[PDB]
Design a protein around this ligand. Structure first.
Ligand SMILES: Cn1cc2c3cc(C(=O)O)ccc3n(-c3ccc(C(F)(F)F)cc3)c2n1
Length: 215
């Protein structure tokens, strides 16, 4: 389906959370838990009433209601990810996150990743990205960013469960809020309220995009 998520001002074009393992000195394995390379869409985006997801993200000061309210509203998305947890976790391992945003405008952006448990923040990663002019447009690349220990521990404890339904029950209360801001104007460029489920057998990691609307 669609390649990227975002507006004309800012688009997320690439994203993957992965594990790199050195099997031996001449061998390397890479496994993707989640990525945006396979949109399960056949497009005009379907919408979700934002009031149905407030409980799942931090509220009060700095919260999703406050952010959505300040706008712009066309920059707010709900992204459903199916996580691929089929990998043998073996020392010589790297858990990383790669993301790439693009713009027509030359900006300095702030990328905030809030990991949430039961709607409450457990981790916040703030990364500042400066525009790189590449073949006609500005690119903001966060290459191989180290995964936070919380998330490394979470992936291990989730894999330990003997059934996908048990992992889905855990992932029901696990969310990620991604916010990209113009560091100089303070304008919200892109907001993604991420929800998670485990992928169904042989299909692999997938995602589905919805527009967040108030009414
Ligand atoms: C859209 N998004 C952003 C991220 C992200 C950031 C980090 C980080 O910066 O430390 C770590 C893991 C992250 N994942 C992520 C989610 C679920 C699973 C799991 F457990 F389901 F496999 C595995 C990784 C994400 N998805």
């Amino acid at each position: 389906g669609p390649r990227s998520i975002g507006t004309t001002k800012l688009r997320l074009v690439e994203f993957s959370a992965f594990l790199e393992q050195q099997r031996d000195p001449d061998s390397y394995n890479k496994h993707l838990f989640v990525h945006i390379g396979h949109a399960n869409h056949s497009p005009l985006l379907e919408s979700v009433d934002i009031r149905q997801i407030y409980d799942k993200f931090p509220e009060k000061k700095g919260g999703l209601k406050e952010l959505f309210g300040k706008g712009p509203q066309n920059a707010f998305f709900l992204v459903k990810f199916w996580a691929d947890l089929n990998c043998n976790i073996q020392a010589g391992a790297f858990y990383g996150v790669t993301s790439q945003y693009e713009s027509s405008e030359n900006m300095t952006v702030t990328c905030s990743t809030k990991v949430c448990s039961f709607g409450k923040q457990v981790v916040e990663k703030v990364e500042t990205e400066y525009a790189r002019f590449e073949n006609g447009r500005f690119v903001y690349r966060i290459n191989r960013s180290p995964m936070c220990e919380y998330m490394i521990n979470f992936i291990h404890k989730l894999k330990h469960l003997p059934e996908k339904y048990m992992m889905n029950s855990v992932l029901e209360n696990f969310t990620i809020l991604l916010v990209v801001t113009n560091r100089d104007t303070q304008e919200t460029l892109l907001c993604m309220a991420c929800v998670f489920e485990v992928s169904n057998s042989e299909h692999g990691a997938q995602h589905h995009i919805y527009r967040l609307v108030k009414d």
